[PDB]
Design a protein around this ligand. Structure first.
Ligand code: NA
Ligand code: NA
Length: 274
């Protein structure tokens, strides 16, 4: 009936859901291409669109629905199961159906999340360059107590070259890498002095536009696993500042190898929310 993607047990998330920690009442914004609100295995509680011509509750591309799915697909008997099934999900469309969006459209997106009280902000987007405003936008969301998690990048390792992208590159933002189901790092995963943790990214199955589920690859898939893990930790220890949460994710991580390719290693929501 319900499929449990490899990532859920990979990061010990299933152990936490067992204790009864599902991330209920935690507000999480997915800053992506929108979310097919009508998907049965998903429940968007609200949000906003900073993209012209399209509401936030529609996904013209598929990316946003897949990512939102990894964070909180309903713990029911249909489709998949997400990392934090009881999270209050927010669709913040800042990327058009082509998967591209402006610095401003994104900054506005981040601005809305903080002002509207999201405890976690997920950004599975990024590019070769950043912005003075974007930098400011994330440092404040963070100073304001939100957990900003972003995708590291699908730029492979170009030697000793830093392929980590923005917004990830910033220090107030968590740069997530990608591992397969074997816990080995996936080839597309970006390498850099900023790679912070690794989460499932290869062959991630989740909800997908027009009431179905697909398998995709990318650090974009890795990212909603830590945003999902932040949610469980916060549901367990509510009065935990963003920094404490950030620390327990990295600190407790399962070492796999060199931090330039792994950061602190694979995550372990169970050790983290301890
Ligand atoms: Na489900
Ligand atoms: Na960062």
């Amino acid at each position: 009936a319900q499929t449990v993607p490899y990532g859920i047990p990979l990061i010990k998330a299933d152990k936490v859901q067992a204790q009864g920690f599902k991330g209920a009442n935690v507000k999480v914004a997915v800053l992506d291409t929108g979310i097919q609100a009508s998907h049965p295995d998903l429940n968007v509680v609200g949000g906003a669109s900073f993209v012209a011509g399209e509401a936030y509750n529609t996904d013209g591309n598929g990316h946003g629905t897949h990512v939102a799915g990894t964070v909180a697909a309903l713990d029911n008997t249909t489709g998949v199961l997400g990392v934090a099934p009881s999270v209050s999900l927010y669709a913040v469309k800042v990327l058009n159906s082509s998967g591209s969006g402006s610095y401003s459209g994104i900054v506005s997106g981040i601005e809305w999340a903080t002002t509207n009280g999201m405890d976690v902000i997920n950004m599975s987007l990024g590019g070769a360059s950043g912005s003075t405003a974007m930098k400011q936008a994330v440092d404040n969301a963070y100073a304001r107590g939100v957990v900003v998690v972003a995708a590291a990048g699908n730029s492979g390792n170009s030697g000793s070259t830093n392929t980590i992208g923005y917004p990830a590159k910033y220090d107030s933002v968590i740069a997530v890498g990608a591992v397969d189901s074997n816990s080995n790092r996936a080839s597309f995963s970006s390498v850099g002095a900023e790679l912070e943790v690794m989460a499932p990214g290869a062959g991630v199955y989740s909800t997908y536009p027009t009431n179905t589920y697909a398998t995709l690859n990318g650090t974009x898939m890795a990212s909603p696993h830590v945003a999902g893990a932040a949610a469980l930790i916060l549901s367990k220890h509510p009065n935990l500042s963003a920094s404490q949460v950030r620390n327990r994710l990295s600190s407790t991580a399962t070492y796999l190898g060199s931090s330039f390719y792994y950061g602190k290693g694979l995550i372990n929501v169970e050790a983290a929310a301890q």
